[PDB]
Amino acid sequence: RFLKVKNWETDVVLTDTLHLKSTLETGCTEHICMGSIMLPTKDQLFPLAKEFLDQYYSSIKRFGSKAHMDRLEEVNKEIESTSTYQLKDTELIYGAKHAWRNASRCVGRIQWSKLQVFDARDCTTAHGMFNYICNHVKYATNKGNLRSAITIFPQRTDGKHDFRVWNSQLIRYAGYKQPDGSTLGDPANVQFTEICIQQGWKAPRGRFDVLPLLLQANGNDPELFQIPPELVLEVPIRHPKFDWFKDLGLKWYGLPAVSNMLLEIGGLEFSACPFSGWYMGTEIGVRDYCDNSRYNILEEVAKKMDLDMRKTSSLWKDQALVEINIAVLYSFQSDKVTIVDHHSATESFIKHMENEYRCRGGCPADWVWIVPPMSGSITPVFHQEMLNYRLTPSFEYQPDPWNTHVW
């Protein structure tokens, strides 16, 4: 019941008690592990609020206090009365920082307590949402010196008045299906680049067109807004050796801002809560650039390197994969835009695990996601045993709006 994790590279053993506070489920059973599966009323609400408020008041060392008991009382009243309740700004901030702290798939959590929270709960319209999002983007971008932020739109009420950002990230590149049959731009966003035009967007049919925001306020039809280009920081990608690299025509945006997730605090559901940090270099160079179902530029880059692409045994994909990732990092760094390499970030995570085990008694972590998509075993996390479990507050996945929107 009191669990240990061993690091096989350093013999360091940590003991995990935190997992016993776990409330949600994993998909796994004693008979089968689903560790590699990508996505496995008034009554419900007060215990949920209670547990949250209890951990909140314990964190400020006022567990079992007047204010504590009073707040529980006050929240208990408001639920009984209104069937929902509203968070204090203090609780909202604590809640958000903690959903990030608890995101078992996030390698970047060492920075969890340094989140800028923007309370956008007074928002009523898509234009309103657009305004808050532009403010978020400008604030987080910070001329290249990136700062983590989240902007929180009103909480779900009856699932009819939902606030939703339809973009999966605030900033993504368009992708267009061709008569040629191939794909121009980012193939991940073909369907979204369609719905944008299917709702009125005028695509400049390019390779790296910044997609328009599709914003849904109070469960209404979504509206298209173009983010001011001067707010979208992009990095042209060159290699610190191969000057043919610039010719490839590649760039990427500085601000990774995940916008499709659902933030759950004390039972309350924030369906629109776009958040942003900064990139680990592999996200762009390994996944965004070299994934088969993405920009898949491996074959081209290898050719330009004149590699023996005849046999897989030459490891030409590996060679190029490395150079590509060297270039992403080099471009960002030279352009003074925040980025972290997978070595630095994984090392930071181990230190953070150490810290969390020490000061909190554990740190939930999904090894399948924490290990970088390249050079896995030359990073410390590879040899780190991890325990995966779900704590609240949390970020959860949620259905794509176009499958759900009661139009």
Is 323 annotated to bind a ligand? Reply is no
Residue 343 contacts its own copies per CB under 8 A: yes
Specify the residue, 109 or 239, whose C-beta has the smaller distance to ligand M62. 109
385 binds ligand H4B (CB under 6 A): yes
CA 241 to chain centre: 32
Asked if 6 and 387 count as a contact pair (C-beta separation under 8 A), the reply is no
Which of the 8 DSSP states describes residue 12?
-
Q: Please choose which of ligand H4B, Zn ion, ligand M62, none residue 382 contacts, taking the beta carbon within 5 to 8 angstroms, the exact cut-off set by kind.
A: ligand H4B
Report if residue 113 touches ligand H4B, rule: CB under 6 A: no
Residue 174 beta carbon to ligand H4B: minimum distance, rounded to whole angstroms: 21
Reply yes or no on whether 283 is catalytic: yes
Q: Among residues 100, 112, 278, 316, which one is catalytic? A: 278
Q: Which of 80-88, 97-105, 224-232, 304-312 is the region at the interface with ligand HEM (rule: CB under 6 A)? A: 97-105
* 368 in a known ligand binding site: yes
* Cβ(218)–Cβ(176) below 8 Å: no
Any catalytic annotation for residue 166? no
**Structure tokens given for 354:** 């150490």
21 makes contact, choosing from its own copies, ligand HEM, ligand M62, none, with CB < 5 to 8 Å by partner type, with none
φ and ψ of 323, to 5 deg? -55, -45
- With CB under 6 A as the contact rule, the residue among 103, 140, 211, 324 that binds ligand HEM is 103
Q: Is 57 annotated as a binding residue?
A: no
Binding ligand M62 (rule: CB under 6 A), the pick from 214, 263, 280, 324 is 280
To the question of whether residue 106 is assigned a binding role by annotation, the answer is: yes
Total site size for ligand M62, rule CB under 6 A: 9
Tokens standing for 17? 């008690």
Is residue 36 within 8 Å of residue 368, measured between CB atoms?
A: yes
Phi and psi of 355, rounded to 5°?
Answer: -65, -45
**Catalytic status, residue 106:** yes
Active site residues: 106, 109, 278, 283
Binding site for ligand M62 (CB under 6 A): 168-169, 256, 258, 260, 277, 279-280, 283
